[PDB]
Design a protein around this ligand. Structure first.
Ligand SMILES: *CCC(=O)N(c1ccc(C(C)(C)C)cc1)[C@@H](C(=O)NC)c1cccnc1
Ligand SMILES: *CCC(=O)N(c1ccc(C(C)(C)C)cc1)[C@@H](C(=O)NC)c1cccnc1
Lengths: 304, 304
């Protein structure tokens, strides 16, 4: 019993973190096999940030200009290339701690763990969700760039995020491991505003199922609804529309609790309309949306 | 910017988790040097749980009755002893991944990370606090016993908790690494009720400082208070009394934000009396108490 915002064990990713320095800029890199991946903005100086031409800035850089340190030992850079917004630094040594891995590009609403690092050293691990506006609400200070987001399936780490920047509103933007930003963001010091941060409806429902499994049942109402009626209310409350695909993925939680997905939607609809009335669900006074249906099943079943 | 419930990187602890089986009971063990630490209730059978006499149950156990598996390889048990509620199984092999470590007994209000494990394999990591009633609100399923709680200071892991059981209310109880339970709990299947789960006042204040540092300032009021006036309100709201020791440890946060500790107490007093009015602080609709002043400083400074 008990339901926590849980991150994946970070050991496999800790074994991949390195420090990357170019000139006077130092950030984090991800060392997998003989390649170190890092944000291309490591090549930017004190003011280049405003309107950088990365191809031009990169012409002035050679392999020896990128300093890669793994632990307290230096790695030899034998090649470098830019792929979208990431630099790939080929080193002469394969990372001996390289886990089985994949690079995946996640969809909004999908959750992942972040290993926040500074100077190639891990400071903490926390669980995030890719927001519907393609930002993440992380905890990142100066020097955290290059910290990565990931999911683990037994022994295979799927890297889905690399931290690049903080928007003027304090929310975060980054890329997949192929260097493509999530959302419309660009790696330059220009004012970039985020769109509406809507609530991930399918994740709230999954978390309401988690609450029922854990004994928190006060919110269960005597009503049902339809997807169309529910979505009219969801739109009004800035919740993402629920599709039949979302209903399908909530099926195992519906089966475990015996609560039809549309009945849980009606309970959620009443929570939106009536508020919590000072009550809490799983120790929260607001509806949590950073647990996917997969996360609820995983945590409630003890997948290792 | 951004403030997250962050756990310590778990790699150093993942390297210590093993599976311990005695008869038909399997739980987790912590392998440090040539000793495997695990809850003594691993020796209890299907019904022994009701009124176990551990000394008597242990007489029927020999070294070969404890099966310790690290990864997919078996460790040889060459000694066993009971220290309070933990068993210490001496093995013939020192754990090659033993980090620098300490065993500490924490006070209520102190936070720590938990690496939840099943069958000696890590499933997730989350941040907890030792509640003022000496329970923890964890996320633990059957087989999670032996999972540990810890803090890290650079390279030294201080182990502070080992999971033993779930109370009938779904809250958790365990011991320090010397086998002494936190609180009055006993390792037996008897109804044991927890005391009042009061709010850790010093931690709420630390988190209100974290919110100011991160731009969440709406709650800052035009008032101040005294420790005695604040505590009259704190007692009324089931908040722990604030001492001058708590004021002293909040000093660095008071200095960074320029907000006197007693002024933050007055803002907290108004939040208690007026409620949040549907507003949020650091994405929460309730006052968070599982961040210590040390955690706020660490996260806001990027300690690795
Ligand atoms: C890792 C660098 C860093 O801390 N940045 C940062 C600075 C500059 C840039 C470019 C404009 C792309 C050259 C990118 C990232 C911080 C930032 O975004 N400042 C505007 C940063 C601070 C806090 C959290 N993440 C990043
Ligand atoms: C790790 C065992 C387990 O899952 N228990 C458990 C069972 C029995 C006992 C004794 C009574 C001391 C012999 C202790 C622990 C669960 C439990 O506490 N059941 C009552 C358990 C379930 C969920 C979370 N933690 C533990």
């Amino acid at each position: 019993s008990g339901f926590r915002k849980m991150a994946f064990p970070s050991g496999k990713v800790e074994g991949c973190m390195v420090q990357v320095t170019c000139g006077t800029t130092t950030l984090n890199g991800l060392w997998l096999d003989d390649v170190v991946y890092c944000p291309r903005h490591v090549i930017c100086t004190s003011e280049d940030m405003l309107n950088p031409n990365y191809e031009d800035l990169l012409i002035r850089k050679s392999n020896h200009n990128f300093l890669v340190q793994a632990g307290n030992v230096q790695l030899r850079v034998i090649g470098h290339s830019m792929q979208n917004c990431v630099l790939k630094l080929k080193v002469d040594t394969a990372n001996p701690k390289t886990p089985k891995y994949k690079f995946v590009r996640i969809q909004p609403g999908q959750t992942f763990s972040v290993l926040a690092c500074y100077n190639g050293s891990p400071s903490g691990v926390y669980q995030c969700a890719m927001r519907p506006n393609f930002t993440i609400k992380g905890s990142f200070l100066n020097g955290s760039c290059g910290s990565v987001g990931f999911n683990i399936d037994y022994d295979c780490v799927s890297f889905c995020y690399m931290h690049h920047m903080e928007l003027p509103t304090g929310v975060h933007a980054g890329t997949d491991l192929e260097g493509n930003f999530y959302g419309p963001f660009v790696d330059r010091q220009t004012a970039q505003a985020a769109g509406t941060d809507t609530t991930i409806t399918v994740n709230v429902l999954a978390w309401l199922y988690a609450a029922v499994i854990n004994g928190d049942r006060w919110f269960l109402n005597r009503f049902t609804t339809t997807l169309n009626d529910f979505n009219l209310v969801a739109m009004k409350y800035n919740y993402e529309p629920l599709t039949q695909d979302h209903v399908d993925i909530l099926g195992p939680l519906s089966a475990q609790t015996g609560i039809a997905v549309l009945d849980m939607c009606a309970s959620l609809k009443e929570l939106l309309q009536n508020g919590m009335n000072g009550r809490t669900i799983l120790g929260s006074a607001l509806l949590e949306d950073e647990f996917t249906p997969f996360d609820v099943v995983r945590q409630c079943s003890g997948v290792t």
